Structure 1
């Protein structure tokens, strides 16, 4: 499964081949997003911007369009999960939208309701740099530090 130099190919043919009786399965990968802000709404919105920043350079997205994502949860952690998941879906399913920026307009901390919007356009390999695909959001070692200088830690599955 490798690209070889003519030199390396020389080696291989020189020696008896080895019988292989094995295979590789279930390759998995993940990365932990850490985001922060002056408010809890800033930390979530930065978190969504981190996620998308791992899919491309958002600096190259034009804010042609606007999208709104509204969601809710049982607690802040679930709220963050859904918040990220809905956004991911907007990218994943047609329209395959990607925001240049996200802004969280409001978070209700009693009932765990959230309003956000993002501005950008249709994602395209011809137009926009390629980075890593994002497979899913995960509750793995998820933290919401709702306090002075809020911080958010989220693990996402990738390729």
Structure 2
């Protein structure tokens, strides 16, 4: 598993090698995004930007293309999940798109519908810094504080 000095190496040869009957399985990992704004709409776009920030320095993304994402939900929590899930999909399939910025144009609170756009380009390792892969969005500990100064809390799965 490890990378060791020739000194560390020498020690290994100096002792009887220690028989091993184990294995490591299902390594998992996550982080919690907290994002906030003047309006609820901003609090979603910021949270989408937060996620993408963990994948790269989004400040090094040119705003060449423009993508919409429109989605529906049962409640706000439901909404914010599919919102982040569709964006994540754009990165991970088809054009492998990375927005520099995401902007939620509209959110409907009676019927839990949302319109948004992001301007960026396709992701490249050559052009863009590397950061953590995002595995998936999970509902655990999700919170949508719809009030004066909205806030949003979301846990995702990372490599």
TM-score of the superposition, structure 1-length normalised? 1.00
Deviations for 1:32-88, whole angstroms, at most 9, x for unmatched residues?
000000000000000000000000000000000000000000000000000000000
CA distance in 2 between counterparts of 1:59 and 1:157 reads 23
- Give unmatched runs, 5+ long, in structure 2: none
Residue segments in structure 1 that go unaligned for 5+ positions in a row: none
Deviations 1:86-121 (A, max 9, x none): 000000002100000000000000000000000000
Paired residues, number: 159
Give the whole-Å Cα distance in 1 for the aligned partners of 2:88 and 2:5: 40
Give the CA RMSD over aligned residues. Answer: 0.3
Tell me how far apart the structure 2 counterparts of residues 13 and 95 of structure 1 sit (CA, whole Å). Answer: 51
Aligned mates of 1:35, 1:27 — CA distance in 2: 27
